[PDB]
Amino acid sequence: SRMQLSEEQAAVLRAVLKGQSIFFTGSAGTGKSYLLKRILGSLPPTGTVATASTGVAACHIGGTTLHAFAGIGSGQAPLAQCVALAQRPGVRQGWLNCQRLVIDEISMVEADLFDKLEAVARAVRQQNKPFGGIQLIICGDFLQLPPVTKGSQPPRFCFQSKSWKRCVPVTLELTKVWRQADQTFISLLQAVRLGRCSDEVTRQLQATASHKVGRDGIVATRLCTHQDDVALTNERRLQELPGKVHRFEAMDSNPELASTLDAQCPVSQLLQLKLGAQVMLVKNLSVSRGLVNGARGVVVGFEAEGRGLPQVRFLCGVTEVIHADRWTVQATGGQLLSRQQLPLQLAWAMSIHKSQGMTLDCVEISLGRVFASGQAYVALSRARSLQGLRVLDFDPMAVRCDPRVLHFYATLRRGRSL
Ligand SMILES: Nc1ncnc2c1ncn2[C@@H]1O[C@H](COP(=O)(O)OP(=O)(O)O)[C@@H](O)[C@H]1O
Ligand code: ALF
Numbered sequence: 001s002r003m004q005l006s007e008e009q010a011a012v013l014r015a016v017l018k019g020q021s022i023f024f025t026g027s028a029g030t031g032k033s034y035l036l037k038r039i040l041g042s043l044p045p046t047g048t049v050a051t052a053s054t055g056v057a058a059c060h061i062g063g064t065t066l067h068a069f070a071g072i073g074s075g076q077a078p079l080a081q082c083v084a085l086a087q088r089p090g091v092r093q094g095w096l097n098c099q100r101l102v103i104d105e106i107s108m109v110e111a112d113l114f115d116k117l118e119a120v121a122r123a124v125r126q127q128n129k130p131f132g133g134i135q136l137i138i139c140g141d142f143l144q145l146p147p148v149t150k151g152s153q154p155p156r157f158c159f160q161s162k163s164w165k166r167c168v169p170v171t172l173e174l175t176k177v178w179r180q181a182d183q184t185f186i187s188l189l190q191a192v193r194l195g196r197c198s199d200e201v202t203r204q205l206q207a208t209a210s211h212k213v214g215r216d217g218i219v220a221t222r223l224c225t226h227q228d229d230v231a232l233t234n235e236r237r238l239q240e241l242p243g244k245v246h247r248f249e250a251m252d253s254n255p256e257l258a259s260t261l262d263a264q265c266p267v268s269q270l271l272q273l274k275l276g277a278q279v280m281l282v283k284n285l286s287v288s289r290g291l292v293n294g295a296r297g298v299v300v301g302f303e304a305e306g307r308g309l310p311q312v313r314f315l316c317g318v319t320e321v322i323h324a325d326r327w328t329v330q331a332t333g334g335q336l337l338s339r340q341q342l343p344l345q346l347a348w349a350m351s352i353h354k355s356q357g358m359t360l361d362c363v364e365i366s367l368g369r370v371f372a373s374g375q376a377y378v379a380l381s382r383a384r385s386l387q388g389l390r391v392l393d394f395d396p397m398a399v400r401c402d403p404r405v406l407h408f409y410a411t412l413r414r415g416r417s418l
């Protein structure tokens with residue numbers, strides 16, 4: 001009972017199916033992610049792999065991080081070390097077989113990584129050809145969130161790679177903001193992508209202080225930039241609770257690798273919950289009842305048997321007793337690692353890093369500061385609801401755009417239709 005595809009959305013699929021290594025791109029909430037799900041529905045599913053930048057925005061479209069797939073850790077070391085690792089039992093085949101590769105949020109891949117892959121691709125598989133032959137279906141938003149700075153100098157976007165133009169000949173554009181309803185909020189947020197604050201932008205978003213966004217016993221609360229802010233916030237907000245502490249330690253195929261799980265995963269070693277605690281759903285469960293990836297709920301009890309499993313009411317409204325599930329990661333080695341743990345993370349505080357790839361309903365964000373170019377746009381363009389959104393301490397030097405990029409979406413603009 002699925003909805004209609006845009007004439008554009010459709011044309012991408014038509015093009016991908018033929019068998020073209022295409023890339024696609026457009027604003028926050030224009031069905032980049034979703035189109036991938038319907039492409040993954042249409043693609044012969046043997047040797048067809050799916051991936052993303054963030055370990056979360058994969059648990060979202062049911063793949064793994066480009067990292068864990070490729071099996072070369074950080075990609076720091078040279079072309080000869082990197083092909084050592086790809087050659088290893090497990091990874092070797094992972095490669096040989098992939099006929100089709102899909103990557104969401106390409107923004108947070110940094111070109112020297114892309115390049116170091118392309119080479120390794122041609123390497124193990126032995127094709128004398130672009131990316132070892134493999135059909136690249138990519139997407140992301142460049143003006144959204146850019147790659148994590150390794151050292152000090154500026155980190156280097158993916159479109160700036162030398163392989164990039166050689167590996168993804170074609171590029172096409174998505175154009176309508178399906179996410180957000182209200183047409184003011186469409187231009188309001190189309191502005192901030194391009195990096196403009198004239199005073200109605202600034203007035204309206206300032207307006208939202210007096211908004212009270214927090215809904216049914218449940219807040220999709222603050223989007224901080226820094227991760228230690230996030231985890232710390234909650235460590236208080238949960239202490240600030242009368243009930244007793246229910247501990248949930250995991251059960252990993254390897255104990256001593258837990259850290260690799262930790263950072264590639266979406267869950268903690270030790271997750272701790274009391275009554276009334278707020279939480280989020282990190283894997284999909286039942287897309288019918290609507291326990292999807294990114295559910296906002298509140299801990300309404302535990303049972304007194306089993307492992308005392310949590311009970312949760314959600315925003316979508318339906319109530320389910322949560323069991324533990326199982327994640328696996330191709331841990332640079334050719335070992336697959338397991339973890340058994342609840343698919344819940346404490347949903348008071350969430351980094352802007354995590355929130356990219358996702359949609360939201362019920363958000364807060366402080367903007368009395370300056371933020372890394374893009375970092376502003378992202379956290380705003382999460383919310384569906386302009387009414388159920390609250391900005392704090394707004395400041396127009398928050399709104400920053402990298403112009404290397406703006407000129408990338410000018411060079412494309414200036415040889416096209418409108
Ligand atoms: N063809 C469509 N028409 C209307 N809404 C759509 C369509 N495809 C997806 N959506 C909705 O639009 C929103 C944005 O999708 P998403 O894939 O998260 O975009 P992006 O990856 O650009 O952030 C989702 O809430 C989804 O429900
Ligand atoms: F472009 Al997105 F969530 F993938 F806004």
Ligand SMILES: [Mg+2]
Binds near residue numbers: 033034356
């Ligand atoms: Mg997405």
